[PDB]
Amino acid sequence: RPNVELCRDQAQFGLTDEVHQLEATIAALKQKLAQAQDALDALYKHLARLQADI
Amino acid sequence: PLKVAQTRLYQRSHRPNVELCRDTAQFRLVSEVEELNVSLATLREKLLEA
Amino acid sequence: CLLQEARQQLNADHRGKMETLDIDRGCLSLNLKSPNISLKINPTRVPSGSTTL
Amino acid sequence: QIRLNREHKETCEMGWSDKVEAYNIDEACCRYHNQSTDVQFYPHSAKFEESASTPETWAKFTQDNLYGAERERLASVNLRELIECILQDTAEDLRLQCD
Amino acid sequence: KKVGEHLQDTHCWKSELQRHVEELVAETDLLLAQKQRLERALDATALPF
Numbered sequence: 001r002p003n004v005e006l007c008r009d010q011a012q013f014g015l016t017d018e019v020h021q022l023e024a025t026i027a028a029l030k031q032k033l034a035q036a037q038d039a040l041d042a043l044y045k046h047l048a049r050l051q052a053d054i
Numbered sequence: 055p056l057k058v059a060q061t062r063l064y065q066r067s068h069r070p071n072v073e074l075c076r077d078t079a080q081f082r083l084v085s086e087v088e089e090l091n092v093s094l095a096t097l098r099e100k101l102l103e104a
Numbered sequence: 105c106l107l108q109e110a111r112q113q114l115n116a117d118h119r120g121k122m123e124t125l126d127i128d129r130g131c132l133s134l135n136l137k138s139p140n141i142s143l144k145i146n147p148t149r150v151p152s153g154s155t156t157l
Numbered sequence: 158q159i160r161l162n163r164e165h166k167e168t169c170e171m172g173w174s175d176k177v178e179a180y181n182i183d184e185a186c187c188r189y190h191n192q193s194t195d196v197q198f199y200p201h202s203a204k205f206e207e208s209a210s211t212p213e214t215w216a217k218f219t220q221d222n223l224y225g226a227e228r229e230r231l232a233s234v235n236l237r238e239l240i241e242c243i244l245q246d247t248a249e250d251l252r253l254q255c256d
Numbered sequence: 257k258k259v260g261e262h263l264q265d266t267h268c269w270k271s272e273l274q275r276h277v278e279e280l281v282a283e284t285d286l287l288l289a290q291k292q293r294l295e296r297a298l299d300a301t302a303l304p305f
Contacts, residue, residue, distance in 0.1 A: 143174035
């Protein structure tokens, strides 16, 4: 917007805090993915131990 | 290292189009996949002979 | 002369609101499927020239 | 010139967006190690090898859009100087005619 | 080593792209001011008419 109607308005407020919340959300899902794949590595280790003892 | 190789190549298979058109690291990973295949084959033969 | 200067600045304000409706209507039309979606730099910035409500 | 400037700005920042997605993936690729978690043997496929712009062509189109952005900025500067000269001549001429 | 080299190359190109888009933004703002001054030239060339 050129000169004076470039306005820090409610739409700009919503876009900015949705950007911040989206960053937080993507961080939370990456943390959850890392935790779940750590659990998967634990499953693979215990499965291999079961294979050996069987 | 097979896990590391396949995970690195799979993650790099998520890049955008103009970037996901091969790299020196990509060639290195692809070649050492075959190198590890040869190594596992040799270790399996050694285990059977043991 | 006074009415002429009032006409000129109201014309400027009206043309500004023309293009502002164009820009914000494009923003409302933009959605997830659009072919010009990008990841912008410093998007939560306040440019020099910002006014309040 | 304003709308051409904004169009080429859009092109260069789309290049930046692709750069950032590639960097965000490849730094996590670098962060991997042998004792690390969250690794899996994904099956061998051609998905790891697609083709749009090889590293030489990658740097080529990067240099192309950067050089075009430079050309756009020089063209805008020449237009600015033209605006300066035009407005100075206009004011000077009409003031002389009034006198 | 090869992956880190790719990171460094992408970082260099990303920095160059940031510099060019910032220069384009500043140039666009100043040329907007020049057009806006041309608008007062058009406005003030009417009362002499």
